[PDB]
Amino acid sequence: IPVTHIKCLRINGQIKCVKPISPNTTPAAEHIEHVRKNPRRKAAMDRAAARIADKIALKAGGETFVSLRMKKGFTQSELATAAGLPQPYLSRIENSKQSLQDKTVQKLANALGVSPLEVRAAFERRYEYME
Amino acid sequence: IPVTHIKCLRINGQIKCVKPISPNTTPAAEHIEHVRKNPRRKAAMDRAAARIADKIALKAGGETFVSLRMKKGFTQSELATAAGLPQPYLSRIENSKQSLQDKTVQKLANALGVSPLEVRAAFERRYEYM
Ligand SMILES: NC(=O)C[C@H](N)C(=O)O
Ligand SMILES: NC(=O)C[C@H](N)C(=O)O
Ligand SMILES: [Cl-]
Ligand SMILES: [Cl-]
Ligand SMILES: [Cl-]
Ligand SMILES: [Cl-]
Ligand SMILES: [Cl-]
Ligand SMILES: [Cl-]
Ligand SMILES: [Cl-]
Numbered sequence: 001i002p003v004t005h006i007k008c009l010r011i012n013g014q015i016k017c018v019k020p021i022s023p024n025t026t027p028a029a030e031h032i033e034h035v036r037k038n039p040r041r042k043a044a045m046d047r048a049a050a051r052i053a054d055k056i057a058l059k060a061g062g063e064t065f066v067s068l069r070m071k072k073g074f075t076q077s078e079l080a081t082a083a084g085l086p087q088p089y090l091s092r093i094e095n096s097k098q099s100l101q102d103k104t105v106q107k108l109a110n111a112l113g114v115s116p117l118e119v120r121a122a123f124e125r126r127y128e129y130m131e
Numbered sequence: 132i133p134v135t136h137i138k139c140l141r142i143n144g145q146i147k148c149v150k151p152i153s154p155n156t157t158p159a160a161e162h163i164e165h166v167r168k169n170p171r172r173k174a175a176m177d178r179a180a181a182r183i184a185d186k187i188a189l190k191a192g193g194e195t196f197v198s199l200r201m202k203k204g205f206t207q208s209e210l211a212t213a214a215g216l217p218q219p220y221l222s223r224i225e226n227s228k229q230s231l232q233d234k235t236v237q238k239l240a241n242a243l244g245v246s247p248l249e250v251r252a253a254f255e256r257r258y259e260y261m
Binding site: 004005006007017018019020021023025026027028031032035045048049052055056059060064066070075077088091092094095096097098126127128129130131 | 151183260
């Protein structure tokens, strides 16, 4: 039953203790990136993503955040890059997160070229409402 | 400015409101999987992963959780499948999370075939002690 002291970053009303190590370029990521560099390959993938996004929308109640990302032809990696976000954080936005800050909605809206309302409406499909 | 009521799942002292839909196959995931189905390709990638894992360990103080995963030749997808975990949760384990439940450490230790201590020591490299 021990105690140990760790250095943490306090940056404007927010504590950051965890330092996730950041080597963006991993072989699997590197691979898909090279595959998508061919426009003919990219399209083939895109059409598959769209078809799968339909199955997601129907299954889930309507357009989800992932669903929408897929129909616009963005891999999670591509969208993360387009929207000035880290991919881990984007993964959380697609799967785990309960809300989005306004600034993020806008970054994402711009990246995908759709309205804030669209982004927000998609995000909110992870819930089950009742009226 | 109204109020909208949402249905949430309460399951043994834990609330689950968010439903992240799960059809497990996307084209990018599908692609790498097929690429890794060739053992000759898998190896080429594995050797690259290991080399990159070295740069990670040196940069970061020692073996990190990602580092370790890479040296054993597991893509995040592969390790998530091997350890009976969801890949979103695994991504959070590698990047965001502050601790691991004992049950998880064990699931992971088994998947990678290393000790709990190794898993734990790796995870703890995301901090700066003194
Ligand atoms: N999250 C962090 O990076 C905190 C760390 N102690 C630092 O050097 O800033
Ligand atoms: N997220 C889940 O696992 C289920 C969801 N909480 C529901 O509405 O039942
Ligand atoms: Cl693109
Ligand atoms: Cl989260
Ligand atoms: Cl809006
Ligand atoms: Cl009601
Ligand atoms: Cl009900
Ligand atoms: Cl994809
Ligand atoms: Cl990898």
